[PDB]
Amino acid sequence: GGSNATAPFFEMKLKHYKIFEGMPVTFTCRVAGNPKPKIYWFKDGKQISPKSDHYTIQRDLDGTCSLHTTASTLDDDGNYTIMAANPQGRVSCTGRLMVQAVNQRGRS
């Protein structure tokens, strides 16, 4: 709290994303918090580590942070909720990503 600061706010929020099973997904979200919130990513409550098996996180200090899914499958279908946690509080926004099952997917 204190003073001389600005509460976190998603000046660019996520939306309802849709993808075919096995295909890559790229999405990003921008905040106007001050100080710049330590943007955290987690999927259905599952904390995401930057540069994981399929979950690549890139946080720009400018205020824009991106999350890329290399291969979004039915097990990756869910809500990639983003949290703008900073000294002035925290705000959650739903990163909904739905996956269409593909019967022709040999990697399924």
Side-chain angles (χ1 to χ4, degrees):
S3 68
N4 196 26
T6 301
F9 176 77
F10 295 103
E11 65 178 352
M12 184 181 77
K13 292 179 179 180
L14 297 175
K15 63 182 183 179
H16 185 183
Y17 301 108
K18 293 184 182 180
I19 195 69
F20 286 99
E21 184 180 359
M23 298 297 288
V25 183
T26 302
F27 56 96
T28 185
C29 191
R30 184 181 172 89
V31 297
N34 190 337
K36 301 287 169 166
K38 294 183 180 179
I39 296 302
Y40 295 108
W41 296 90
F42 55 96
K43 190 267 192 197
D44 289 348
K46 298 177 178 185
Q47 185 179 5
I48 298 170
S49 175
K51 298 180 179 177
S52 190
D53 288 348
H54 297 285
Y55 293 161
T56 299
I57 297 172
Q58 178 67 50
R59 306 184 292 178
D60 187 351
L61 294 175
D62 196 60
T64 299
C65 295
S66 301
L67 174 61
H68 175 73
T69 299
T70 297
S72 180
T73 65
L74 294 174
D75 287 346
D76 299 307
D77 184 341
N79 301 299
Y80 294 78
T81 301
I82 165 176
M83 178 174 70
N86 77 357
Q88 303 304 308
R90 63 182 184 180
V91 182
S92 294
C93 179
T94 301
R96 184 177 182 185
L97 173 63
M98 296 296 292
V99 179
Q100 168 65 50
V102 179
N103 288 339
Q104 300 300 313
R105 180 69 68 194
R107 296 180 182 174
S108 181

